[PDB]
Every structure is written in C-alpha cells, then in structure tokens.
C-alpha cells in the first residue's frame, strides 16, 4: 500500500538514543492498534462476524436496549481496512509517525511528574504537567483537575482487560503509549462544558488520526476516517449531553465497584422519547428527563458485558458518573479507549447541548434536567 501522511508530519532526524525511544513508543502503538483490530472483529454475544455493540440503550419502540455487530457499519469495516494496512506494513505506516514533541496546533500535556516517571519516552517529549496547568487556574475546575491528575495512575489502573482484550492496552501494559501521548484539557476552559467538576476531570488523548501521533491522510488514495485514543471522566461527575456529525466507539476499561458507577446514553437523535422540531438544514431537539424519566435511558458500563457502544451520527450521548457508588468510592472514574470512524468529513466538533432554563444552569447540568440540542444536517 501506498501511505500519504498528513500535511503537518514533518520527517525528522533522531539521534541513535533518541530513535529508541520513539521505537518504543511505535511498537506499542502498534500493539494498541492490532488490539484494536481484534477487539472490531473478534465475535461476541450474538454477533457471528463481529463485535456485538450496544447502539441505543433505550429503544422507544421496545423498551429495551438496541445492538448491532460493529462492523456492519461500512465506515467502521473502513476503519479496520485502515488498521490492517498500518499492520501489514508498519515501516511504511512510521513514515507518518510523531512523537509530537514540538507539535504547534494546541497545547498537549503529561497529567503529572509521577506518569511522565513511567517512560523514558515521555521524560524526552517532557510536555507541560497537568498539575501545574491547573494548579495556576485553582478555583473549583482547578481542585477537580488535581484530584484528577495527581491520582491519574491510580484511576486509569483500574481496569479490567482480561475478557475483551488478549494483551493489556491499559496503562499498567502500555506505559510508553499512555505516559507520551498527548494528554488534552479539553472542557477546562469551556464555559458550556456543564459542571466545575466535569471540567477540570475531563481528559482525551488521541494515538491515531488526524491530530495524533500517527497521522495518516490517505491510504490507496482512500481518506483515512480513523481516529483511535482513549478517555478519563473523574467519579461524581456528569458528562453534560452531546452529539457532533463522526461515528464514534467507545470500549469500557474500568471495572466498576458498583453496577451502577459508570452509566452512559446512546439515543439516536430521532429517538421517540426525544421531540424534534426541524430547524433550518438541522433539527431542534428536546430531551425531558426529570422527574425519573432519564433513567430508563441509562444502561450501565463494564468492562465484560455492556463494554462496547457505537454511536451513529448526531446520536445524543451522556456519560453520568454521581450515583451509587459514586458517593462513596475515591481516585476512581470512567476510563475508555475512544475512537471515531469519519474524522475527516463533516463538522468534527462536539456539541454540548444546553439547559432550557438558560445559561444560569448550566453549572448543574445533569441526566434530568431538561436540555436543547442544535443538530446540524450532514453531508451524505
Ligand atoms: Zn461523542
């Protein structure tokens, strides 16, 4: 195959020392793209061909959560086409490789001295502490971002990888991978991002796609849709509802010291219990949890049954971390690999849907109060 990188991967010169630990860094990319692959494509459930993933966790019709096997979804079986190219010839695939030390287009971080002491790699790349980032803004995102960062290994340990997973992709088996990759505040300074909380406990990282280490425009001439990374969501938290045009997958890693620790929400935007009112090329769409009316909706994430979803596009999603347990553990939360199948068509940028009852509420904004979404049509 024929592998064109993204414009901003510019070929660099290493030093005999400095070419190995981007070795290391590549080899276990490599092992959390192949484990990726198999995690697509190994059968569960009742799905013969494919992994079986949740795609709705309320059908209005049924009163039941919905499924499908994954790689029924053409962009997702182009995703795994992509991973298998990179696979097959990875030499050729490292050409679009960086370790995104100097990287220009937004700031990437380590969460804390303690993780970057994990690798020589990311020692090297020596990016910017989380825990200075939010030790300056202080305030209450600022406490959640420490109580975050200075516990990050201790959260992103607690996972279970022994069902879905044949090697551990976890921090604990990849600590080059999840110590160098650039770590992304990403809700820290949005002021429609929900709760103080949420926002300083909010983290992604992304390995694969556009704005990762590997960076890969086209393969064979065919746009490479793949965006492959991984996510941490501090406990007692609520993930405000959200939708954006890309596909999107999330596979659990946590393993939860309660049922119910961990909930998340898929419903496609058309989705009964919802009203829609079309709005200009898009729709406007109402979501009434209160009163009990949102838990329905919410199904409970692990890591061996209710482990994978898939998101259609402008599907609504929450992620709620305050019940149960929540009120009772600590250093724990909801930590994912994360991916999206089309990150180079479309509007990329994810959606926060707002509190009815205006801006004054958005600070509280949780599974039952009642929220506005703004959809935007898509190009077939
Ligand atoms: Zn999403």
Same mark, same amino acid.
């Given at each position: ?16 020392? %400095? ?80 370790? /995104? ?52 290994? %201790? ?105 119910? /620790? ?88 994810? /959606? ?29």
């Amino acid at each position: 195959a024929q592998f064109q990188c993204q414009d901003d991967v510019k070929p660099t010169s290493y030093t005999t020392e %400095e070419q190995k630990l981007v070795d290391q860094f590549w080899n276990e990319s490599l092992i959390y793209l192949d484990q990726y692959l198999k995690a697509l494509e190994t059968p569960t459930g009742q799905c013969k061909d494919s992994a079986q993933a949740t795609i709705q966790t309320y059908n209005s019709e049924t009163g039941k959560m919905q499924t499908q096997c994954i790689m029924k979804y053409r962009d997702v079986e182009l995703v795994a086409k992509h991973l298998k190219a990179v696979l097959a010839e990875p030499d050729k695939a490292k050409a679009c490789f960086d370790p /995104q030390k100097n990287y220009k287009a937004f700031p990437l971080y380590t969460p804390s001295a303690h993780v970057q002491n994990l690798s020589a790699t990311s020692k090297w790349i020596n990016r910017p502490l989380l825990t200075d980032y939010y030790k300056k803004i202080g305030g209450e995102i600022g406490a959640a971002g420490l109580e975050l960062n200075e516990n990050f290994l %201790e959260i992103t340990s607690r996972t279970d990888t022994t069902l879905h997973w044949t090697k551990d992709v976890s921090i604990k088996g990849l600590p080059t991978l999840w110590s160098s990759v650039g770590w992304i505040p990403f809700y820290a300074e949005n002021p429609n991002a929900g709760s103080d909380r949420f926002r300083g406990g909010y983290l992604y990282a992304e390995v694969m796609g556009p704005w990762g280490n590997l960076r890969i425009k086209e393969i064979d001439g065919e746009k490479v849709g793949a965006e492959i990374g991984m996510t941490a969501q501090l406990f007692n938290t609520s993930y405000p509802y959200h939708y954006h045009h890309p596909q999107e997958i999330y596979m659990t890693l946590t393993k939860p010291q309660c049922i119910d /620790q961990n909930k998340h929400m898929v419903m496609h935007w058309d989705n009964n219990q919802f009203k829609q009112k079309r709005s200009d090329n898009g729709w406007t769409v109402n979501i009434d949890g209160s009163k009990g009316k949102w838990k329905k909706w919410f199904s409970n994430q692990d890591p061996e049954q209710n482990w994978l979803t898939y998101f259609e596009r402008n599907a609504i999603h929450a992620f709620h971390t305050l019940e149960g347990c929540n009120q009772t553990i600590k250093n724990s939360g909801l930590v994912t690999v994360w991916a999206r199948t089309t990150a180079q068509d479309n509007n990329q940028t994810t /959606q926060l849907c707002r509190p009815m009852t205006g801006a004054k509420d958005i600070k509280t904004m949780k599974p039952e109060d009642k929220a506005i979404c703004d959809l935007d049509d898509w190009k077939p």
